[PDB]
Structure formats: structure tokens, C-alpha cells
């Protein structure tokens, strides 16, 4: 309903952006095959598991697209500001062009700009103190520096769980979070729905989406520690590659 859960317009426009993504992607210039294309086939050759993104070549892609217009929408300022969507959406933009999220096989990482590229002139990376960390940076892409403690043993964490009705066939994909879950039963199969008899579903381990996360807590460099107080610590999320 309107007047409940309002909508609010924002300067952010994803439609054109996603296009812009497809444009820079594998259609790229500075780095005969464009870097993303070739890299993409190396993955497509099955050889390369993860994909590291870099914003600098995006900076270059824009100065290419700025000048040398038409004026193109600024991804960086939008990425660092959100970037969370930018992950998944970027992923879709890619998945099309290759030499769904269930079958991806590749990991996507990004590398922030400091840099000489800052010096372009062009923030996303300001190595920061956990003190310097404010609870207002949530969702921002940030770069920081600190002492590694903890640094954990990777364990497979599952993303989504596949059960199969085998009566209605189909599949049951249950995403999973936090520590624990309760396995689903009966059948949610749209065919097993409204039937007098719903199929019974049992999971299949080969199907489901699992991941090895790897955990760490980081502590203030302690030179950065304010004169008083004590050095702070911070948890961090890492998975896959």
C-alpha cells in the first residue's frame, strides 16, 4: 500500500547504471582483448575462480567516458555509498556475457582506490582507526589498518538449501542465515501446493550452495589509540576466495 512503507525518490538510478556496467565490462580499453573479456574467458576456461574488481580502471573508464562524453553516471560515488547491491547487480551484468546465482562458480572481489588515482584528482580507501570508525559508516566501503588477532579457520557455511519434492519433483531452495536452521518438510512445490497431498522433500547435498567463510577480529594499531582509553577491536567478514 501507499502511505504505508513509503517510496522516496533518490538521485540514484540503477537502470542506466547497469547499462554503464555492461559498457565498461569486457568492453574496456586501457587493458588486443579488453582486460575483462580475456580475464572472463580465463575464468570461462574454468581456470579462474574469483574475480577482483578495481575502481581505478573504473576511474579511467569514466575519464574516458567523461571527455569524450557523453557524461556518464558516476559509479564510484554510488558504489562506495552502497556497493552492496553493486555486488549482486554487477554479478548479473557479468553472468550474461561469458565466453542464475545458483550456478555462478565465480567469486567477485573489488579493490578500492587510494591513490595516485586520488591524486588524479579524484576516499573510499582511507585507512582508518576503529576509533575513527563511526557507526555512521555502515554500508560504506571502507579501508582500514589494524592488528590482526583472531584470524579464523575457514569452515563451510551454506547459503541456500536444496530439497527435492520427488513427487512434485522441482526443488526447494531454502536460504540460510546465522548459526542454525530448521529443515523444511512436506513440499512447498507449487504443484504440491493445493493438492490434497503435498510431496515430501529431502535435501540433496550436491545441490546446495555452501561456502567456506574465514573469520577475524582486528585491533587498533595502538599507535592510533587515543592518549587514554584502550585500543578497540573489530570483527570482519570473509568467505570464498
Amino acid at each position: 500500500m501507499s502511505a504505508a512503507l513509503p517510496s522516496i525518490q533518490l538521485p540514484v538510478d540503477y537502470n542506466n547504471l547497469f547499462n554503464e556496467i555492461t559498457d565498461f565490462l569486457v568492453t574496456f580499453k586501457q587493458d588486443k582483448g579488453p582486460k575483462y573479456m580475456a580475464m572472463l574467458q580465463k575464468v570461462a576456461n574454468r581456470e579462474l575462480n574469483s574475480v577482483i574488481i578495481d575502481l581505478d580502471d573504473i576511474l579511467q573508464y569514466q575519464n574516458e567516458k567523461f571527455l569524450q562524453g557523453t557524461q556518464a553516471d558516476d559509479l564510484v560515488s554510488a558504489i562506495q555509498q552502497n556497493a552492496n547491491h553493486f555486488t549482486e547487480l554487477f554479478c548479473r551484468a557479468i553472468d550474461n556475457n561469458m565466453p542464475p546465482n545458483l550456478t555462478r562458480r565465480y567469486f567477485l572481489y573489488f579493490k578500492p582506490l587510494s591513490q595516485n588515482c586520488a591524486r588524479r584528482y579524484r576516499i573510499s580507501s582511507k585507512p582508518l582507526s576503529v576509533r575513527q570508525i563511526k557507526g555512521d559508516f555502515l554500508g560504506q566501503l571502507i579501508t582500514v589498518r589494524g592488528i590482526i588477532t583472531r584470524v579464523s579457520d575457514v569452515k563451510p557455511a551454506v547459503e541456500v538449501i536444496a530439497y527435492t519434492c520427488d513427487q512434485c519433483g522441482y526443488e526447494v531452495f531454502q536460504e540460510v542465515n546465522s548459526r542454525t536452521f530448521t529443515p523444511l518438510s512436506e513440499c512447498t512445490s507449487e504443484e504440491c501446493s493445493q493438492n490434497q497431498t503435498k510431496g515430501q522433500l529431502f535435501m540433496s547435498t550436491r545441490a546446495s550452495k555452501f561456502s567456506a567463510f574465514q573469520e577475524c577480529k582486528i585491533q587498533e594499531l595502538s599507535q592510533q589509540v587515543p592518549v587514554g582509553h584502550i585500543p578497540r577491536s573489530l570483527n570482519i567478514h570473509v568467505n570464498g576466495t
Binding site: 512503507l5 517510496s7 547491491h85 579524484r122 584502550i230
Partner: protein, 601 residues
């Protein structure tokens, strides 16, 4: 569109236009804030190539400007406040519109009716704007708290919104609406939530006791918690002494809701919340008393008389008595420039067979002591410690409940059965005493907190009465830097002499059948005024002594350290304070010498 603008609200905002336009002082102040942010924004972008939005408001203005808006906010902060903050955010938008938040206010004041302390509070003060002062405990360990919700909706694109009103939201409460977590839009399109769009705010809530100093003679303390968020969060440590501006909330259903006693959890929101300074009494010396001090200060023998004034009941130990006095005084305090602070105060310790009144005296100490807490053996938990009150209390901000020493900072800590106390504590004591501070990493809030409290302790002879003949050490029984740490170590003996005994029992019987009132009075003024500083007059005497001390004493007895020296220092400075002298004098030196000797011998 919501419930549509009310000329209630409209006139409230509109009415708050001229103010703040007059007084225009704020009008530029906000601009300053913006400026600061802008400049910092350029520093991040161009160089490698911040400030809060609340602005204080003096309540003095309103009375002149608007008595009814004055009175209204004071009484009905609920109504007046929100529209005002709106006006603010608007003018803010006006100042610099082009480039692309609450924009709160402190509400300075000019308080108040509505000036009351945590002891005297509610029920009429309920849901009015209030200013209360007191100590900070049990504090809190902030938790970040989330705001407004955002969702992407495919294939419809678009977006959603949501908001969340905490029980702490606003101040005066409201009919609460649970919003849960928006998902699965109707029509049934799922909603992909988005962060970084969705705003959040850090969260914290701390408890405030009524001012220990201003506390009544004796009774149970009555404290109240307040929530503080984002900007307000973390400004002060537990054990800080502060006055808080915030509204009185009743928030929560008081049991009438679920049909199947106590009611209506109540709390203070924010707001201004100023940290304030206090010494390290009350009292009132008028003209006459201060004069009395002044005249008396001239009296040459005054110090001994003082030293006598303490022990109506106690024979002897005038050395000790004098000692206590000096404890009350304490050699000023010295914080070097960009360097550690010299401890001014002295820690004292007494050893002897029981019936020494050691227990008894300590009470007398506590009495005129002007604070502070007393502790006996074990004792604990944490003594001075915040315990890092878990969990939260309230909102998710994990409280730090300031312990004895922190609370006793500025004050006299009595340690009874000091021997009994656990070494576990003792480790800390090393820090507290010497380092003069406490540090807490526990879980948790990572902070070092300052307890400046002075120290005295009484502990039994190691075993039985054997203290007397026993070797200077192992009579001790609590090595070691312990032993070093107490500035003073006193060995009292219960050994008997018939003559002495008669002398006692006379006094004793008489008891059964220089006025102390004036004492603490004489104390406070002396305390705040004035610091003797130091004089090369003595310095020689002192070094002479000290060298004699390490020199001949290390043969005689032990330990003699630089510690010994500093103790001398504090000692003299205090004696000057007793003298009231704005300077140090060599006589005072002779005294501190005499005493230290007595300590040694």
C-alpha cells in the same frame, strides 16, 4: 503526506522563525557547522588526491522573546520541540541548499523549575524538560542502533521506505507502532533491502546517581538512567560528575496491557548532557568562620592543637593523628606539561595488635572525612570497578557501573582488614594507587578511568599479636610494592605499662560521663585555597635527610626509595597547607622529617 500539517505545528514552526532570526547568532552558527563539514569534505577528496548537526540554544532568549514558548517547551517539550527542530532543519537547508538529518539542539538554559536533582524527581516533573546533576554510573557500552528502512523492488524497480520510533524516540511517549522488518511487498513482489541508504544511529544509556557530595547525611541513593545516542554517546566516563538536560519519559506499558504492581519504566532522553568539574563539604564559612581560620592560621602552635582535635577518645598516636591530618591535606597535585602527573596524595597504613582502635579510628576518619567510601577486607566486588555492567541497561549499551575508588576519586578510601583482601584485587591496587588511574579493557568498553582517591589501610599483625618483637619484615605479611605503595606504614603496639594503663583508664572512665564542627570547615577552604607551591629553602634539608635515609637506614632497616623522597615532597607541601602558607618553608620540612623518622623510628 502522513497526517497532514497542523497549524498547531505550522504556527509552532512559523512562530519559531523570528527566533532564531532574533537572536540571529545561531543563524550563522549553523553555517559554521556546514562550513566545517565542507572544508573537511575537501580535505578528503583533494588532499589524498564531520561535526554534529545539533546546535545549542540558550533558554534565556525565550523568556524575553517568547514567554509562552519558553513555558511551553519547558512544560510541553513534546509539542514545542519537534516543530522547532523542524524549523531548524529547514533554515539549515536554507543556509547552503545546493550541495547534497535531524539538526538537533542542546537547549542551554537558564534553568530551571525543572532544575531538580535525581533525588527529587517526578511525578509532576514527569514528562517535562528537566536538568539533573550527579555522578556517572552505571554508564553503558554503546551499541550501534539502526534507522529508517529501504527496499528495492523488482521488477517494479522503485523503492520503499520505513521508519522506526524507539520508546526513547521523541521524549514524551506515544502510542507505539511496531513496524518489524519490511519485506515481501504487496503486491507480492519481494523487497530487496538496501543498506547505506537505510540510516542508523549509535545507541547508549547510562545511569545517574544523585550527587554524592550533595547526598543527604546518610540513606539509600536514588539514581536514574538516561539514553544517549550517536553524538551524545560516549562523552563521559562512569564516575564523571555531570548535569544532564533531558526530558522525563514514562515509556512503556505498566502492566495494564497484559491482563493476567510496578509500572511504566521511566527514563530521560539525552540531551544536552554537560560534563562538569568538581573538586578532584559543602560548605558555608560566611564571614566569621573564614576570619576565624585567618586569625588562627597565625597561631604558631596551631598544628599540634589540630593534631589533638582528632582524638577526643584516643590517647597517644599524635604522630598518627598528625598523619591523618596530612592525609586530609595532601601535598597538592602536579600534572607536568605533556607528561605524567606527580601524585600529590599519600597512602597510609597502620599495623598493630587489635583493640588498637584501628577499626575505631577509621570510623572517625570516615566521619569528618568529607566523603569517601570505606572498604573492609573482602569486600569487593571490583571495589573501585565498573564491573562493566552486563548487559546493557539500557538499549543495548552495556553499562559501566563506577566502583568504589572511581566513586571515591577525590576522596578517602578506608581499607579495613586490608590483609584479608585478595591479592587478585591487590594487583589492581598497584595500578590504582601509584598509577593514580584505573584502566578497563574488559570485554568491552576499552577505557582507562581516573580514581584519584587517597588511601588508608589497617591490617592485623601477620599472626596473633606477634607483630611487636617480630622482624621488621615478615611482621609485614603483605609484600611488597604494597608496602612501598602506602606512603605511610604505622606499627602500633599493645604492650602494657601500669603507669600508662592508669593514664588510660582515667580517660576511659571520664569518657563514660577546637570544636570538630569547625574542623572540616577549616579543611575545605584550606583545600581549595591555596597551593603552597615550593621553596628552595627546604630543598636542601630534604635532600640531606633523604641521603641520610637511604644511607644509614639501608643498614638500619628498609625499603628506602625515590618513593621515600616523593613522600617527603607531598609531606612538606601539605604541612605548608596546614600552615596555609602560599609557599613551602624549612620548618614544615623539619616536621615531615620528624614524622618520617617516627615512621622509621
Amino acid at each position: 503526506t502522513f497526517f497532514a500539517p497542523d497549524a498547531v505545528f505550522g504556527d509552532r514552526v512559523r512562530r519559531f522563525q523570528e527566533f532564531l532570526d532574533t537572536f540571529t547568532s545561531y543563524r550563522d552558527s549553523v553555517r559554521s557547522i556546514q562550513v566545517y563539514n565542507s572544508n573537511n569534505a575537501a580535505n578528503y577528496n583533494d588532499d589524498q588526491d564531520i561535526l554534529p548537526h545539533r546546535i545549542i540554544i540558550s533558554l534565556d532568549d525565550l523568556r524575553e522573546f517568547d514567554r509562552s514558548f519558553w513555558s511551553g517547551i519547558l512544560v510541553e517539550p513534546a509539542y514545542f520541540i519537534p516543530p522547532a527542530e523542524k524549523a531548524l532543519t529547514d533554515l539549515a537547508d536554507s543556509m547552503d541548499d545546493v550541495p547534497h538529518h535531524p539538526w538537533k539542539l542542546s537547549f542551554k538554559g537558564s534553568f530551571g523549575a525543572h532544575a531538580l536533582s535525581p533525588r527529587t524527581l517526578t511525578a509532576q516533573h514527569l514528562n517535562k524538560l528537566v536538568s539533573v546533576e550527579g555522578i556517572v554510573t552505571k554508564t553503558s557500552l554503546v551499541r550501534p542502533k539502526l534507522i529508517r528502512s529501504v527496499h528495492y523492488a523488482a521488477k517494479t524497480g522503485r523503492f520503499h521506505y520505513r521508519d522506526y520510533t524507539d520508546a526513547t524516540t521523541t521524549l514524551t511517549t506515544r502510542i507505539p507502532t511496531p513496524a518489524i522488518y519490511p519485506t515481501e511487498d504487496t503486491e507480492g513482489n519481494k523487497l530487496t533491502t538496501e543498506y547505506g541508504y537505510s540510516t542508523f544511529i549509535d545507541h547508549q544509556r547510562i545511569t545517574v546517581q544523585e550527587m554524592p557530595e550533595m547526598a543527604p547525611a546518610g540513606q539509600l541513593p536514588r539514581s536514574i538512567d538516561v539514553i544517549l545516542d550517536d553524538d551524545l554517546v560516549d562523552k563521559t566516563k562512569p564516575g564523571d560528575r555531570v548535569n544532564v538536560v533531558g526530558v522525563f519519559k514514562s515509556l512503556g506499558a505498566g502492566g495494564m496491557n497484559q491482563s493476567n504492581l510496578i509500572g511504566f519504566k521511566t527514563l530521560i532522553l539525552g540531551n544536552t548532557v554537560y560534563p562538569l568539574h568538581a573538586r578532584s563539604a559543602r560548605q558555608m564559612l560566611t564571614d566569621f568562620d573564614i576570619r576565624n581560620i585567618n586569625k588562627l592560621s597565625k597561631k604558631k602552635d596551631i598544628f599540634d592543637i589540630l593534631s589533638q582535635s582528632l582524638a577526643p577518645s584516643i590517647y597517644g598516636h599524635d604522630h598518627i593523628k598528625k598523619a591523618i591530618l596530612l592525609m586530609l591535606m595532601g601535598g597538592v597535585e602536579k600534572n607536568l606539561e605533556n607528561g605524567s602527573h606527580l601524585r600529590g596524595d599519600i597512602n597510609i597504613l597502620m599495623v598493630g595488635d587489635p583493640s588498637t582502635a584501628k577499626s575505631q579510628l577509621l570510623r572517625f576518619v570516615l566521619n569528618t572525612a568529607s566523603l569517601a567510601i570505606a572498604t573492609t577486607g573482602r569486600g569487593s566486588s571490583g571495589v573501585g570497578l565498573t564491573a562493566a555492567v552486563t548487559t546493557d541497561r539500557e538499549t543495548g549499551e552495556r553499562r559501566l557501573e563506577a566502583g568504589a575508588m572511581v566513586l571515591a576519586d577525590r576522596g578517602v578510601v578506608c581499607i579495613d582488614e586490608f590483609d584479608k583482601m585478595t591479592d587478585v584485587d591487590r594487583v589492581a591496587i598497584h595500578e590504582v594507587m601509584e598509577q593514580q588511574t584505573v584502566t578497563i579493557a574488559k570485554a568491552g568498553i576499552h577505557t582507562t578511568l581516573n580514581a584519584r582517591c587517597s588511601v588508608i589501610a589497617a591490617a592485623n599483625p601477620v599472626f596473633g599479636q606477634y607483630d611487636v618483637n617480630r622482624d621488621p619484615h615478615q611482621n609485614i605479611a603483605l609484600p611488597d610494592s604494597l608496602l612501598s605503595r602506602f606512603d605511610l606504614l604505622f606499627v602500633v603496639t599493645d604492650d602494657i605499662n601500669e603507669i600508662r594503663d592508669r593514664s588510660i583508664s582515667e580517660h576511659v572512665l571520664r569518657t563514660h560521663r577546637v570544636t570538630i564542627p569547625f574542623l572540616r570547615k577549616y579543611v575545605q577552604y584550606a583545600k581549595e585555597r591555596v597551593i603552597p607551591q615550593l621553596t628552595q629553602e627546604a630543598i636542601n634539608v630534604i635532600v640531606k635527610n633523604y641521603t641520610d635515609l637511604r644511607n644509614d637506614d639501608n643498614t638500619k632497616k628498609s625499603p628506602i626509595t625515590a618513593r621515600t623522597l616523593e613522600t617527603l615532597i607531598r609531606l612538606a607541601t601539605a604541612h605548608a597547607k596546614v600552615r596555609l602558607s602560599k609557599t613551602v618553608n624549612k620548618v614544615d620540612a623539619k616536621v615531615a622529617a620528624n614524622l618520617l623518622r617516627f615512621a622509621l623510628l
